[PDB]
């Protein structure tokens, strides 16, 4: 009888301790939950992104042979928007002018022929070019997705062969 | 009597714990899980079209037919099929009647 | 002891209070069916090639009630002297829809 | 007494798993800390909506304007350089009597810098409105849009 | 009797902990009163 | 001792399953709401529609701006909706089959909240 | 001026090495290219959502009292 009550009280005390562990913004609790999410995402995407990034680095280093202005921002039309893209010197990967801490600055178009979007894109090239984003490993490490397996996207193969 | 009520309470416990463990309880979790579900749907729909090289009979004119080997890339998010034939990409919009009437004989004559 | 049963009932009451106060929208979203994502190729699944006389036609297209001919690469209506033989050599006498082609 | 043995073994399994997890966490807490630090973006992807990440803190006017004519562009004014034009009218400057006069830029880059700068410098000059009407300017504005 | 008292004591303590940890996040009056 | 076991189960349920769920939900959604309010915009453009959010004791709730005919206002009018004070709004909690793509729009509205978090 | 024009290549569990080499340089056959595998060791951390349920397991000892 007494032993049952003591075990009861012990279980309630352990429940209170676990409640404190869970609802007190503990560092260990937060790190364990973060690791549970991060491990699954890494297992899903990291190696595939690395292989794809190496392939496109090889492709862009082949493409950059004989061209001198391929490492300068040009405003590429992607149908529904403009993107200020160049080819990264170090990795020979597509690079685009970034919008804050998000993805590339996609200047939307209100029709097929939008002079204003083109001109704002040129303004970004002249002014907002200090912040850039790169497809593949950098995009995966900054935004959590690589962009090579999402469509439509300026890094994806379908949007670039269309 | 007592056993039935205790079993009912225990089953209610199990159901509530299962829901709170394996189902979304806030907007972040719900958004993440719906992202995953929509991505899986899109991926399987894209995988419906055979991405491996397939042999079809392609009419290069009104009355001339030739055997050819083509590759198909389907993107159901925007609804387009890109057919690589003779090294050239042909983009067919699935919302266009003429594109449908051109692509469907290619798909239905595959072997 | 009746007091312990009352304690269990009070705990169940508190559980229901918390669920009602906080997780009402989540439960309703859980009860309702999922959100349908449009399929661009769904309406083409019943399309089967079947040619009358020597002109290749496409059947099974619901939104185009009239018989729609089959176009070639250069967008010319297909007329073929041996359409029936070609269709027989492709799949056989029985017609094949797009759904059967996709499930191959 | 099978039920008692089953309860003992399952509770022992729970306690032993707790101790194993505690010791593994104790030895690998730092390791998972750097693993999370170097993979912070892998926790939640920025494409939760199924769309590329967008930074709402950086404001872009092109996201909402669904009409081309309402947008501001730089167009070539024949014989007088470049001007900023839209369906509302040309971007103007204060005249001698606090009026509106079309301001003209020497180069496309200057016009783009003035038009798309973060500074609010909008001064509408409609050449088709009643107070300020000019047939040639209105015709040019309507034709160039 | 002792079970009832112990359960109420632990329930009160755990409710106090949860309230103390979650008041800054569930007190929506602060957001409503702020414009 | 079945009843003491049931007391244990329900106590653990509440204080280690439901209350931590409330904690995580409120922390995430309060952070999202604060990030929203830092934008200083009453209505934001999500999925070609205008969405506002409010924080209540159940969490963060999204609403869409509509006109007198319950047709959502396009983003091109955002400047005249933020300045307005009596905008008719439809809450995303209640499903409406008359609006095309309402579920997707409300989904993307909730998803665009969690950019930083 | 030497070119290789392959068609539809489909290889499984194999290696493809198209060299198209037309100079004095000799390709390094069977030269195992080893990189630094900066492997990240996953740890046997069960999802801590197991923590309540495990407690319940301990709780059922009260059934044996």
Curated annotation (Swiss-Prot), chain A:
Oligomeric state and partners?
Part of a stable entry-fusion complex (EFC) which is at least composed of proteins OPG143, OPG147, OPG155, OPG86, OPG94, OPG107, OPG104, and OPG099. Formation of the viral membrane is necessary for the assembly of the complex.
Q: Which organism is it from?
A: Vaccinia virus (strain Western Reserve) (VACV)
Q: Which family does it belong to?
A: Belongs to the orthopoxvirus OPG107 family.
* Annotated TM spans: 2-22
Post-translational modification (record):
Contains two intramolecular disulfide bonds. They are created by the viral disulfide bond formation pathway, a poxvirus-specific pathway that operates on the cytoplasmic side of the MV membranes.
What name is this protein filed under? Protein OPG107
GO CC, any one term = membrane
* Matches recorded under Pfam families: Pox_LP_H2 (PF03356)
Domain of life of the source: Viruses
Curated annotation (Swiss-Prot), chain C:
Indicate yes or no for the key word Disulfide bond. yes
Q: Which residues form a coiled coil?
A: none
Induction (UniProt): Expressed in the late phase of the viral replicative cycle.
In UniProt terms, what function does this protein have? Component of the entry fusion complex (EFC), which consists of 11 proteins. During cell infection, this complex mediates entry of the virion core into the host cytoplasm by a two-step mechanism consisting of lipid mixing of the viral and cellular membranes and subsequent pore formation.
Query: What residue ranges are annotated as transmembrane?
Result: 7-27
Give membrane topology per the record: Single-pass type III membrane protein
Q: Which family does it belong to?
A: Belongs to the orthopoxvirus OPG099 family.
Q: Which cysteines are joined by disulfide bonds?
A: 51-83
User: Which named protein is this?
Assistant: Entry-fusion complex protein OPG094
Q: Name one GO cellular component term.
A: viral envelope
Boundaries of the shown chain within the full protein: 25 to 128 of 128
Biological process (GO), any one: fusion of virus membrane with host plasma membrane
PTMs per UniProt: Most cysteines are linked by disulfide bonds. They are created by the viral disulfide bond formation pathway, a poxvirus-specific redox pathway that operates on the cytoplasmic side of the MV membranes.
- Write the record's keywords in alphabetical order, separated by commas: Disulfide bond, Fusion of virus membrane with host cell membrane, Fusion of virus membrane with host membrane, Late protein, Membrane, Signal-anchor, Transmembrane, Transmembrane helix, Viral envelope protein, Viral penetration into host cytoplasm, Virion, Virus entry into host cell
Q: Does the keyword Disulfide bond apply?
A: yes
Q: Where does it localize?
A: Virion membrane
Q: Which organism is it from?
A: Vaccinia virus (strain Western Reserve)
Origin, by domain of life? Viruses
State which ranges are Virion surface (membrane side).
28-104
Swiss-Prot record, chain D:
Alphabetic keyword roster: Disulfide bond, Fusion of virus membrane with host membrane, Late protein, Membrane, Phosphoprotein, Signal-anchor, Transmembrane, Transmembrane helix, Viral envelope protein, Viral penetration into host cytoplasm, Virion, Virus entry into host cell
Chain ranges passing through the membrane: 1-20
Where is this protein localized, as stated in its record?
Answer: Virion membrane
Can you list the GO cellular component terms from the UniProt entry?
Answer: membrane; viral envelope; virion membrane
Virion surface-side segments: 21-145
List where this protein forms a coiled coil.
none
What the entry lists under InterPro entries is as follows: Poxvirus_A28
One GO biological-process annotation of the entry reads: membrane fusion involved in viral entry into host cell
- Induction record: Expressed in the late phase of the viral replicative cycle.
Q: Per UniProt, what is the membrane topology?
A: Single-pass type III membrane protein
Task: Cite the post-translational modification comment.
Answer: Contains two intramolecular disulfide bonds. They are created by the viral disulfide bond formation pathway, a poxvirus-specific pathway that operates on the cytoplasmic side of the MV membranes.
Q: Domain of life here?
A: Viruses
Which family does the entry's similarity section mention?
A: Belongs to the orthopoxvirus OPG155 protein family.
Chain's role: Envelope protein required for virus entry into host cell and for cell-cell fusion (syncytium formation).
Quaternary structure and interacting proteins, as annotated: Part of a stable entry-fusion complex (EFC) which is at least composed of proteins OPG143, OPG147, OPG155, OPG086, OPG094, OPG107, OPG104, and OPG099. Formation of the viral membrane is necessary for the assembly of the complex. Interacts directly with protein OPG107.
User: Which protein are we looking at?
Assistant: Envelope protein OPG155
Q: What taxonomic classification does the UniProt entry list for its organism? A: Viruses, Varidnaviria, Bamfordvirae, Nucleocytoviricota, Pokkesviricetes
From Swiss-Prot, chain E:
Q: How is it modified after translation?
A: Unglycosylated because produced in viral factories instead of the classic ER -Golgi route.
Give the bilayer topology: Single-pass membrane protein
Q: Which domain of life is it from?
A: Viruses
Give an example GO biological process: symbiont entry into host cell
List where the protein spans the membrane. 2-22
Q: Which controlled-vocabulary keywords does the entry list?
A: Membrane, Transmembrane, Transmembrane helix, Viral envelope protein, Viral penetration into host cytoplasm, Virion, Virus entry into host cell
Q: What induces it?
A: Expressed in the intermediate phase of the viral replicative cycle.
Q: Which GO terms describe its cellular component?
A: membrane; viral envelope; virion membrane
Q: Which residues lie on this side of the membrane: Virion surface?
A: 23-35
**Where located?**
Virion membrane
Q: How does it assemble?
A: Component of the entry fusion complex (EFC) composed of OPG053/F9, OPG076/O3, OPG086/G3, OPG094/G9, OPG095/L1, OPG099/L5, OPG107/H2, OPG143/A16, OPG104/J5, OPG147/A21 and OPG155/A28. Except for OPG095/L1 and OPG053/F9, each of the EFC proteins is required for assembly or stability of the complex.
The entry's function note states: Component of the entry fusion complex (EFC), which consists of 11 proteins. During cell infection, this complex mediates entry of the virion core into the host cytoplasm by a two-step mechanism consisting of lipid mixing of the viral and cellular membranes and subsequent pore formation.
Which family does the record claim for this protein?
Answer: Belongs to the orthopoxvirus OPG076 family.
What is the recorded name of this protein?
Entry-fusion complex protein OPG076
State the organism of origin.
Answer: Vaccinia virus (strain Western Reserve) (VACV)
Gene behind the chain: OPG076
């Amino acid at each position: 009888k007494t032993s049952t009550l003591i075990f009861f009280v012990i279980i309630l005390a352990i429940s209170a301790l676990l409640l404190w562990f869970q609802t007190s913004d503990n560092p260990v609790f937060n790190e364990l939950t973060r690791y549970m999410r991060i491990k699954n995402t890494v297992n899903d995407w990291k190696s595939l992104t690395d292989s794809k990034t190496k392939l496109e680095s090889d492709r862009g280093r082949l493409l950059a042979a004989g061209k001198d202005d391929i490492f300068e921002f040009k405003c590429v039309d992607f149908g529904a928007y403009f993107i200020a893209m160049r080819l990264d010197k170090k990795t020979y990967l597509p690079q685009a002018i970034r919008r804050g801490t998000g993805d590339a600055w996609m200047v939307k178009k209100a029709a097929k022929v939008d002079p204003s979007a083109q001109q704002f894109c040129q303004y970004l090239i002249k002014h907002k070019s200090n912040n850039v984003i790169t497809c593949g490993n950098e995009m995966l490490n900054e935004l959590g997705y690589s962009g090579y397996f999402m469509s439509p996207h300026w890094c994806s193969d379908f949007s670039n062969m269309e | 009597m007592a056993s039935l009520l205790y079993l009912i309470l225990f089953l209610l416990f199990v159901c509530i714990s299962y829901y709170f463990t394996y189902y979304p309880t806030n907007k972040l979790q719900a958004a993440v899980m719906e992202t995953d579900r929509e991505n899986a749907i899109i991926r399987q729909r894209n995988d419906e079209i055979p991405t491996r090289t397939l042999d079809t009979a392609i009419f290069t004119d009104a009355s001339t037919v030739a055997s050819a080997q083509i590759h198909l890339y389907y993107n159901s998010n925007i609804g387009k099929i890109i057919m690589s034939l003779n090294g050239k990409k042909h983009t067919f919009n699935l919302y266009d009647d003429n594109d449908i009437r051109t692509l469907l004989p290619i798909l239905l004559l595959s072997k | 002891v009746y007091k312990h049963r009352l304690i269990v009932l009070f705990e169940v009451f508190v559980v229901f209070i918390l669920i009602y106060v906080f997780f009402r929208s989540e439960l309703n979203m859980f009860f309702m069916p999922k959100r349908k994502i449009p399929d661009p190729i769904d309406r083409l699944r019943r399309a089967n090639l079947a040619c009358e006389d020597d002109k290749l036609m496409i059947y099974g297209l619901p939104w185009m009630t009239t018989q729609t001919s089959a176009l070639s690469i250069n967008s010319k209506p297909i007329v073929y002297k041996d359409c029936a033989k070609l269709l027989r050599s492709i799949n056989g006498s029985q017609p094949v829809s797009l759904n059967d082609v996709l499930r191959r | 007494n099978s039920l008692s043995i089953f309860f003992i073994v399952v509770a022992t399994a729970a306690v032993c798993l707790l101790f194993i997890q505690g010791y593994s966490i104790y030895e690998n807490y730092g390791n998972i800390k750097e693993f999370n630090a170097t993979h912070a973006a892998f926790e939640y992807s920025k494409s939760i909506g199924g769309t590329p990440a967008l930074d709402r803190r950086v404001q872009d006017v092109n996201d909402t304007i669904s009409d081309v004519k309402q947008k501001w562009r730089c167009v070539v004014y024949p014989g007088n350089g470049f001007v900023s034009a839209s369906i509302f009218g040309f971007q103007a400057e204060v005249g001698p009597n606090n009026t509106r006069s079309i301001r003209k830029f020497n180069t496309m880059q200057q016009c783009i810098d003035f038009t798309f700068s973060d500074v609010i410098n909008i001064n509408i000059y409609n050449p088709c409105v009643v107070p300020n009407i000019n047939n040639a300017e209105c015709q040019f504005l309507k034709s160039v849009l | 009797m002792l079970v009832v008292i112990m359960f109420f004591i632990a329930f009160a303590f755990c409710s106090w902990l949860s309230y103390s940890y979650l008041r800054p996040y569930i007190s929506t009056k602060e957001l409503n009163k702020s414009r | 001792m079945i009843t003491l076991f049931l007391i244990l189960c329900y106590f653990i349920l509440i204080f280690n399953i439901i209350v931590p769920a409330i904690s995580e939900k409120m922390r995430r959604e309060r952070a999202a709401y604060v990030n929203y309010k830092r934008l200083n915009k009453n209505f934001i453009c999500v999925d070609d529609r205008l969405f506002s959010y409010n924080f209540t004791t159940s969490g963060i709730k999204a609403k869409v701006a509509v006109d007198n005919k319950n047709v959502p206002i396009p983003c091109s009018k955002i400047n005249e909706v933020n300045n307005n004070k009596d905008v008719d709004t439809l809450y995303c909690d209640k499903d409406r089959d008359d609006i095309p793509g309402f579920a997707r729009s409300c989904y993307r509205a909730y998803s665009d909240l969690f950019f930083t978090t | 001026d030497c070119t290789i024009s392959l068609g539809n290549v489909s290889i499984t569990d194999s290696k493809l090495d198209v060299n198209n080499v037309c100079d004095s340089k000799r390709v390094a056959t069977e030269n195992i290219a080893v990189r630094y595998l900066n492997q990240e060791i996953r740890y046997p951390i069960i999802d801590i959502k197991w923590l309540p349920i495990g407690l319940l397991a301990l709780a059922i000892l009260i059934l044996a009292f």
